[PDB]
Design an enzyme around this catalytic site. Sequence first.
Site, PDB file in Angstrom:
ATOM      1  N   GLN D 226      48.942  33.583  30.396  1.00 32.46           N
ATOM      2  CA  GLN D 226      47.507  33.575  30.086  1.00 32.46           C
ATOM      3  C   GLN D 226      47.147  34.909  29.427  1.00 32.46           C
ATOM      4  O   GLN D 226      46.097  35.028  28.802  1.00 32.46           O
ATOM      5  CB  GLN D 226      46.657  33.381  31.356  1.00 32.46           C
ATOM      6  CG  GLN D 226      46.921  32.041  32.070  1.00 32.46           C
ATOM      7  CD  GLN D 226      46.036  31.783  33.291  1.00 32.46           C
ATOM      8  OE1 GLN D 226      46.451  31.070  34.218  1.00 32.46           O
ATOM      9  NE2 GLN D 226      44.815  32.341  33.298  1.00 32.46           N
ATOM     10  N   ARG D 373      40.232  29.332  39.446  1.00 33.53           N
ATOM     11  CA  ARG D 373      38.825  29.498  39.082  1.00 33.53           C
ATOM     12  C   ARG D 373      38.037  30.364  40.040  1.00 33.53           C
ATOM     13  O   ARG D 373      36.862  30.086  40.344  1.00 33.53           O
ATOM     14  CB  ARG D 373      38.129  28.136  38.931  1.00 33.53           C
ATOM     15  CG  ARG D 373      38.796  27.223  37.886  1.00 33.53           C
ATOM     16  CD  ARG D 373      37.842  26.181  37.261  1.00 33.53           C
ATOM     17  NE  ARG D 373      38.595  25.022  36.765  1.00 33.53           N
ATOM     18  CZ  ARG D 373      38.157  24.167  35.840  1.00 33.53           C
ATOM     19  NH1 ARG D 373      36.972  24.347  35.254  1.00 33.53           N
ATOM     20  NH2 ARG D 373      38.872  23.085  35.555  1.00 33.53           N
ATOM     21  N   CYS D 374      38.657  31.457  40.471  1.00 30.80           N
ATOM     22  CA  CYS D 374      38.003  32.354  41.414  1.00 30.80           C
ATOM     23  C   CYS D 374      37.156  33.477  40.808  1.00 30.80           C
ATOM     24  O   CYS D 374      36.345  34.061  41.512  1.00 30.80           O
ATOM     25  CB  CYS D 374      39.039  32.952  42.365  1.00 30.80           C
ATOM     26  SG  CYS D 374      40.047  34.298  41.658  1.00 30.80           S
ATOM     27  N   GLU D 749      34.581  28.813  35.221  1.00 27.21           N
ATOM     28  CA  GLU D 749      34.822  28.792  36.660  1.00 27.21           C
ATOM     29  C   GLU D 749      33.621  28.429  37.514  1.00 27.21           C
ATOM     30  O   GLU D 749      33.783  28.091  38.682  1.00 27.21           O
ATOM     31  CB  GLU D 749      35.373  30.156  37.097  1.00 27.21           C
ATOM     32  CG  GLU D 749      36.699  30.486  36.452  1.00 27.21           C
ATOM     33  CD  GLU D 749      37.131  31.904  36.736  1.00 27.21           C
ATOM     34  OE1 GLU D 749      36.444  32.821  36.237  1.00 27.21           O
ATOM     35  OE2 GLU D 749      38.149  32.104  37.451  1.00 27.21           O
TER      36      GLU D 749
HETATM   37  N1  LIG Z   1      28.167  29.684  26.899  1.00 33.30           N
HETATM   38  C1  LIG Z   1      29.281  29.014  26.709  1.00 33.30           C
HETATM   39  C2  LIG Z   1      30.486  29.323  27.506  1.00 33.30           C
HETATM   40  C3  LIG Z   1      31.635  28.659  27.246  1.00 33.30           C
HETATM   41  N2  LIG Z   1      31.621  27.652  26.226  1.00 33.30           N
HETATM   42  C4  LIG Z   1      32.960  26.998  25.864  1.00 33.30           C
HETATM   43  O1  LIG Z   1      33.665  26.632  27.056  1.00 33.30           O
HETATM   44  C5  LIG Z   1      35.086  27.041  26.991  1.00 33.30           C
HETATM   45  C6  LIG Z   1      35.379  27.962  28.207  1.00 33.30           C
HETATM   46  O2  LIG Z   1      34.844  29.291  27.874  1.00 33.30           O
HETATM   47  P1  LIG Z   1      34.687  30.404  28.982  1.00 33.30           P
HETATM   48  O3  LIG Z   1      33.679  29.986  30.034  1.00 33.30           O
HETATM   49  O4  LIG Z   1      34.474  31.709  28.236  1.00 33.30           O
HETATM   50  O5  LIG Z   1      36.077  30.403  29.796  1.00 33.30           O
HETATM   51  P2  LIG Z   1      37.568  30.762  29.278  1.00 33.30           P
HETATM   52  O6  LIG Z   1      37.725  30.112  27.954  1.00 33.30           O
HETATM   53  O7  LIG Z   1      37.802  32.238  29.444  1.00 33.30           O
HETATM   54  O8  LIG Z   1      38.423  29.925  30.356  1.00 33.30           O
HETATM   55  C7  LIG Z   1      38.935  30.532  31.534  1.00 33.30           C
HETATM   56  C8  LIG Z   1      38.503  29.620  32.659  1.00 33.30           C
HETATM   57  O9  LIG Z   1      38.846  28.216  32.305  1.00 33.30           O
HETATM   58  C9  LIG Z   1      38.858  27.310  33.386  1.00 33.30           C
HETATM   59  N3  LIG Z   1      38.944  25.931  32.832  1.00 33.30           N
HETATM   60  C10 LIG Z   1      40.234  25.455  32.490  1.00 33.30           C
HETATM   61  N4  LIG Z   1      40.229  24.287  31.703  1.00 33.30           N
HETATM   62  C11 LIG Z   1      41.444  23.897  31.288  1.00 33.30           C
HETATM   63  N5  LIG Z   1      41.528  22.775  30.546  1.00 33.30           N
HETATM   64  N6  LIG Z   1      42.598  24.592  31.574  1.00 33.30           N
HETATM   65  C12 LIG Z   1      42.684  25.787  32.348  1.00 33.30           C
HETATM   66  O10 LIG Z   1      43.754  26.313  32.534  1.00 33.30           O
HETATM   67  C13 LIG Z   1      41.376  26.206  32.858  1.00 33.30           C
HETATM   68  N7  LIG Z   1      41.410  27.401  33.660  1.00 33.30           N
HETATM   69  C14 LIG Z   1      40.009  27.559  34.284  1.00 33.30           C
HETATM   70  C15 LIG Z   1      39.994  29.086  34.676  1.00 33.30           C
HETATM   71  S1  LIG Z   1      40.947  29.535  36.093  1.00 33.30           S
HETATM   72  C16 LIG Z   1      39.351  29.968  33.896  1.00 33.30           C
HETATM   73  S2  LIG Z   1      39.424  31.687  34.391  1.00 33.30           S
HETATM   74  C17 LIG Z   1      35.295  27.733  25.645  1.00 33.30           C
HETATM   75  O11 LIG Z   1      35.720  26.731  24.640  1.00 33.30           O
HETATM   76  C18 LIG Z   1      33.885  28.169  25.240  1.00 33.30           C
HETATM   77  O12 LIG Z   1      33.530  28.278  23.827  1.00 33.30           O
HETATM   78  C19 LIG Z   1      30.488  27.269  25.447  1.00 33.30           C
HETATM   79  O13 LIG Z   1      30.541  26.329  24.669  1.00 33.30           O
HETATM   80  N8  LIG Z   1      29.372  28.016  25.744  1.00 33.30           N
HETATM   81 CU   LIG Z   2      39.104  33.411  38.345  1.00 40.26          CU
END
Ligand SMILES: Nc1ccn([C@@H]2O[C@H](COP(=O)(O)OP(=O)(O)OC[C@H]3Oc4nc5nc(N)nc(O)c5nc4C(S)=C3S)[C@@H](O)[C@H]2O)c(=O)n1
Ligand SMILES: [Cu+2]
Lengths: 161, 158, 286, 795, 152, 46
Positions: D226, D373-374, D749
């Site tokens: 990751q 997702r912590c 998360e």
């Molecule tokens: N205001 C926002 C926030 C997010 N997003 C969209 O949602 C997605 C997730 O964005 P974000 O919340 O920034 O999270 P990350 O991309 O950093 O994902 C990490 C988070 O993702 C989670 N969801 C998962 N989903 C899948 N399919 N696989 C994992 O391994 C996942 N692992 C978990 C865990 S654990 C974590 S820490 C991105 O395409 C983003 O553009 C959006 O449209 N608008």
């Molecule tokens: Cu986490």
Amino acid sequence: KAHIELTINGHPVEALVEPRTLLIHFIREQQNLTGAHIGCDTSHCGACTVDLDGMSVKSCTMFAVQANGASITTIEGMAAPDGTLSALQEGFRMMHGLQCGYCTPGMIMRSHRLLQENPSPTEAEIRFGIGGNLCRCTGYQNIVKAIQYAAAKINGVPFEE
Amino acid sequence: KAHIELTINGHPVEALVEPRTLLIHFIREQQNLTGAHIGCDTSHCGACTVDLDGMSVKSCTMFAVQANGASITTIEGMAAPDGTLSALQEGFRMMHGLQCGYCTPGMIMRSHRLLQENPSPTEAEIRFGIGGNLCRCTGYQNIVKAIQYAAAKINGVP
Amino acid sequence: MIPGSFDYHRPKSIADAVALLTKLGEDARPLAGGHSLIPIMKTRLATPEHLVDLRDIGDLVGIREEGTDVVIGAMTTQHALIGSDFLAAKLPIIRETSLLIADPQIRYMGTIGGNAANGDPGNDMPALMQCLGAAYELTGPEGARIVAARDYYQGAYFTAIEPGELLTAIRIPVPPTGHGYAYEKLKRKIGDYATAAAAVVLTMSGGKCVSASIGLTNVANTPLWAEEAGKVLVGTALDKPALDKAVALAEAITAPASDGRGPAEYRTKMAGVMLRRAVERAKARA
Amino acid sequence: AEKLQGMGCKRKRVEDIRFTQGKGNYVDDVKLPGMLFGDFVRSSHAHARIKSIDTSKAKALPGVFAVLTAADLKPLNLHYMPTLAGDVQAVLADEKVLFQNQEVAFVVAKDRYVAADAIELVEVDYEPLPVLVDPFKAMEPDAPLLREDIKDKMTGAHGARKHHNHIFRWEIGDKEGTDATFAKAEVVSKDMFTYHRVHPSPLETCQCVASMDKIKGELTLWGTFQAPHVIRTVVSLISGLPEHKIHVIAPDIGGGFGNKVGAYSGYVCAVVASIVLGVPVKWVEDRMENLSTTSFARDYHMTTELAATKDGKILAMRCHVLADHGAFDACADPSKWPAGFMNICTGSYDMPVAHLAVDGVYTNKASGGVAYRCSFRVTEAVYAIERAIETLAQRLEMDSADLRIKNFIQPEQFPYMAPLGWEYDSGNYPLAMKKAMDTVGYHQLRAEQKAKQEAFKRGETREIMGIGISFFTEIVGAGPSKNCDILGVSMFDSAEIRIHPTGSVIARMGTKSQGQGHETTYAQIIATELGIPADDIMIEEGNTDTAPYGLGTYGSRSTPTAGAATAVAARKIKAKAQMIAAHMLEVHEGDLEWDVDRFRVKGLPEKFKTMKELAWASYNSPPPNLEPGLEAVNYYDPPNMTYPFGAYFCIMDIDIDTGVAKTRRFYALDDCGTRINPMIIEGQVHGGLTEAFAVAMGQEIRYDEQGNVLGASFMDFFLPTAVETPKWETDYTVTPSPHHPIGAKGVGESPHVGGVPCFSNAVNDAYAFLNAGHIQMPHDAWRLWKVGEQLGLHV
Amino acid sequence: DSAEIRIHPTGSVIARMGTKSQGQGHETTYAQIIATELGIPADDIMIEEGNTDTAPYGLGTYGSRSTPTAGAATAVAARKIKAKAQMIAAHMLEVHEGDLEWDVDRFRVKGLPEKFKTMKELAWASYNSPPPNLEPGLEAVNYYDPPNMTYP
Amino acid sequence: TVEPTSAERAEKLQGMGCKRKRVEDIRFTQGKGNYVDDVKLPGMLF
Ligand SMILES: Nc1ccn([C@@H]2O[C@H](COP(=O)(O)OP(=O)(O)OC[C@H]3Oc4nc5nc(N)nc(O)c5nc4C(S)=C3S)[C@@H](O)[C@H]2O)c(=O)n1
Ligand SMILES: [Cu+2]
Ligand SMILES: Cc1cc2nc3c(=O)[nH]c(=O)nc-3n(C[C@H](O)[C@H](O)[C@H](O)COP(=O)(O)OP(=O)(O)OC[C@H]3O[C@@H](n4cnc5c(N)ncnc54)[C@H](O)[C@@H]3O)c2cc1C
Ligand code: FES
Ligand code: FES
Ligand code: FES
Ligand code: FES
């Protein structure tokens, strides 16, 4: 297809080939030993040179079936197992005996046999001795120096400057 | 080794295999059809699902020798010859039925057979119908939508 | 995940399968749908030297009525059982039970014979077959014989089958038309072996129970036929007093394992609750 | 306009094309010339000294190329590897094993079948030692000495060093003021809430393919990472190979959920084996090893207390956590936060003071803690406060929705400095709570519940109804350089965007998707900023040779960090394009205004230059004062975290006679500020709520008295199928992050963080009228049956 | 033509150019230019050309243009990195940039040579403790439009 | 040479003006260069 068995870089090899398959393609296409290269269609360049049964041979001018039972060394078989490069490989790097690197495998394989034929060649013997190998990048001068370097390394004493 | 002959995605396949070779490894390692996935070691996840002689089969729970003479369809065999996606592949995309994509090949292969078993399934029939396939990303809700979408497209073809 | 190596065989007939099993010995195992055997081969709990695949023996697949029984070939799959409308007309409890076993993929491969011959108290068909009073037809090097499902199980992976024998068919007496039936299963999720399950078949007349038979799944090291429990229901209106007595007698013979599904005391109590619910649905159907 | 598909659009995913056709490229799909396969002989014991390891039979088996043991690693100082928590973890057991299934020897063979055969041939002689699995007894005088390598028999808590099984003590908050408030408060509400051990269980396990090219002296490492750049830097530091000669590649990853942040023995062993043998070595673990030897999640025992007035005003919070870290502290976390952001535990409420203390201890179990997702222990923080709110409400004989409303931090108080140090960026809690309550008809539900309880008391039903509430404040986007770093590397992230002569784009980021849709969503951000259709933009992540350095994807940090960097980098490009437009139009930049996809001369809208024309001009007629080309890079160091929030409501019906619970309705309102792609956010919520359901209702990894790991396979580990998974109802409000370039907060998360307390509060609420007290998770059927059994409901 | 140079946390480098060698030794010589400009050994620098997805856009190699164009871009890009490194050094050593002098591979405080930061230390600091007004990291790009041809 | 002199540090750079030996030579002298005809892909035709 004909069945052939031989030794390449010290390892037994068994394969099926069509009689018309040129040795250079058997080596590059079937054995994936892509160091040997093709630089012409008339047998002049020597980029396809391999050492076969103690002879320098242009593999684009022999069929794989002709090499059944032979022992072949290609550029990939020159470096030592401990990773240390051969005298010739080191000499080509130290003396800047290559640029694009295309003629290099054939040049080193030819030189490998040349120094067994004549361990301490003069500059004239070196130039004549690699007459079957063309290079477009170096103008040959550093290649001659590389071969002299390797010979001195192998012999433990230099000869010509 | 045993000599086996079968058909995969409409193509004749012949090979020599150790009897203990699991079908999932024969497909992934010998045939290089890496769409099918391994997600467990106990036969629960279904990520290794392929269509075999009209059945949905978890290929990690069958030996390649058992499939001698079989006709198998894997995810790579779902698209039409002209490259067009099957209704299910299109539905999964349109309805956001996948995220990491790891369970997708198995989910679509199971769904392919499900819609042949029942062309017009209710939501309860769909959920029960894919009970052998686990997904970690989607929460299944959009996968149900994807399957309903595909059924409507298929039902419109005739 | 990786099984130990073995030799594979594809006998063309029951005779050939039996001869091979007899010759090869304890190191040879029949291979049916493979959905219990391959998983334990993959964990190496089972390391057979030979697998005898019954795949090519057509005489092992099929559903037919013969006299007062329905005879089902050992290689008949769960999917085939569910798909049989003839079977649903005569023994509707089988489809109901089968739909509570595993998942679609496993049901396409798993066979009724393999489910019954396994010896895993987790399997659902064993106690159902005991409830129905089914008989298992076995063919070995010494010939054919029959063993009642009620007498076939002794423990985990311990059954009445002998060396060289194949369970070839299951003979199931056909209950009276209009009979009540139900298979009630409690599990953690789809595909999970029962925390506790009850199989019930009964008949009614003039508001009173005429016949009743009960099987209990996965609440002992073997399936259990709750003979006393069914007996107490006969002659009653299947009211709470009768059900309470049946539950007492069924719980009394359980000896569950304490595992991820919960402690023994919980599973014993659940065998009772599943029994009550199954009797209720069976009563309504009768 | 139809082709833009920028911010806000429900853009369909570009990743789906290959994934739906089996053309994704995951680690086990990789095949290289001469590639071998390696796997581990693992420990049958939870705690024992290794007397002998005979690998002679294995090495003699045809097809086996090597069998590595600790004896082989020491000379390279590789028998232990550093962890993100600042401790070390054994790569191959040396003198003793500390957890069941721990790595003992690494067998390398021609394929995975031969490797499995060889592993069975290795014989290990063990000398049993007393097993420690109960964290509550880890620091007793006579507790077993586990970590002999770093600790010395320290059976106390008043010596030069803690206790041999004590990892750390971390505290924050005003202790004197908190204690004083609790000493005089009219009401003190205390409970010990255990967040049980679970596991992220991604459908694809951990794995890699290491390929040391001995001719070139360069290592290529494909893996389920990751944080690929961090892995490259760590590998460089421990191997001695320079970073420009280590090419780490995180390809498509089948889900991570926090399981793939850290390094595992398998990665180190595959690399060492490839360096030794000169050929590629693949390592792929099976599910049982994944669940029993890779990062566990949770395992926090939280003594939580709230001090309040009789009328419901919360005066202080006091919390102590006993943290079970397993045998080695490999808990992922910014280096200065051993308990992550557990200090966000005062939640959505305005409290004057608070105090938090955490003690971490070693036990004979696999390592981990932060995963699933912590958001760095925020799952635990939210569970603690949302459960405490409910138990305080019961003690006050007050409706818990009203207790929350009476204590919410108000909109006008933002940015709000919470009593444990975090400054919340923005939030409108009353509005969200009201929308949620009105949507589910909250007061009507309470009336319904009351009547059903009376019916139960009259013997008219065996089902009880619970209403679960979870109003939470998340903290995501780990990055201020001041206090956030991963082993010394500041927690910023990055984006590089390059526009081609004809107008299309290649853009890369320092994060790494494992299914979250980055390859679709980052393009939407650029599309809106530059007026370039999203389909004309290619997004890539994971190849350390090409992507700008980043800290990876975890802590829902991608949108807060690399999403911000993407917008800032695009704005740098926009600024240069404005200079190009000014030169072409022969006007001052001040005379130009941006309009969707072009710059126009103010007042003379007929005079304009489109981004496409400007991209071409940057190569064809670059202004003399500017460099040719049109591209930019931004490494974004966030000024603060982002604090998304939510209001979740669950209605649960429970059969008290079997313990079987059935979700009647689950409503989830999430506010993550500006929403980039509603479709993808919805998918993230569905997945997260499903995990929450699983964790609260059945998932668990346990250990018995002998150290045997229990339930570590899909035979018992509760992963719901489509049949058990509830339908999800989602909603939202939009409260932008003031400091973020596009006002977007993370959200990935949130569903798990808020969902677990929601489900657990619904179960606890159902039995509240029967005075069950706090019921510890998971709420599966046998455990809820036991609750009823103990309340006398079955006789 | 162009050059992009990225310094890793531990001090090694990946750099790409828009030209394309066919044997002229660019993979060796571009690294020599960067080495002298930054005080980073040439062996700690990886040079790449030819992959259009990764190398910055350039016009290729012909007309003996590589040294005149990308060679210039390499020096200018390296100088951008050096200017940023000087800012990091001033911040760390707590002096004005004007109080610093370059000595092969490090910035020393004028008149107080014992106070210095090497380029390697600065590269780590750019990721570990970026000065408040600067972005983290240490890299740069230059697209060089020559003022004239060179006439050897 | 722990704290090498300015001259020693400059020499180690192998920078501008030095006869630095070629990095390309390692793969070329061993037949490990990657030229177009060395490329082989699944399904590749001629
Ligand atoms: N205001 C926002 C926030 C997010 N997003 C969209 O949602 C997605 C997730 O964005 P974000 O919340 O920034 O999270 P990350 O991309 O950093 O994902 C990490 C988070 O993702 C989670 N969801 C998962 N989903 C899948 N399919 N696989 C994992 O391994 C996942 N692992 C978990 C865990 S654990 C974590 S820490 C991105 O395409 C983003 O553009 C959006 O449209 N608008
Ligand atoms: Cu986490
Ligand atoms: C994930 C999962 C979930 C499951 N859930 C359930 C469940 O809920 N309930 C349930 O009932 N089952 C369940 N099962 C088991 C499944 O029903 C198996 O198919 C069944 O237990 C065995 O039948 P089989 O045909 O697969 O037999 P096989 O696995 O081939 O063999 C089982 C055993 O019986 C022997 N054998 C098989 N056929 C014969 C024969 N004719 N004569 C003599 N010996 C024979 C074999 O030698 C072997 O020892 C599950 C399986 C999986 C993988
Ligand atoms: S290719 Fe020119 S002599 Fe062989
Ligand atoms: S080095 Fe180029 S042809 Fe000889
Ligand atoms: S790999 Fe999980 S069922 Fe086949
Ligand atoms: S899409 Fe990731 S497991 Fe289903």
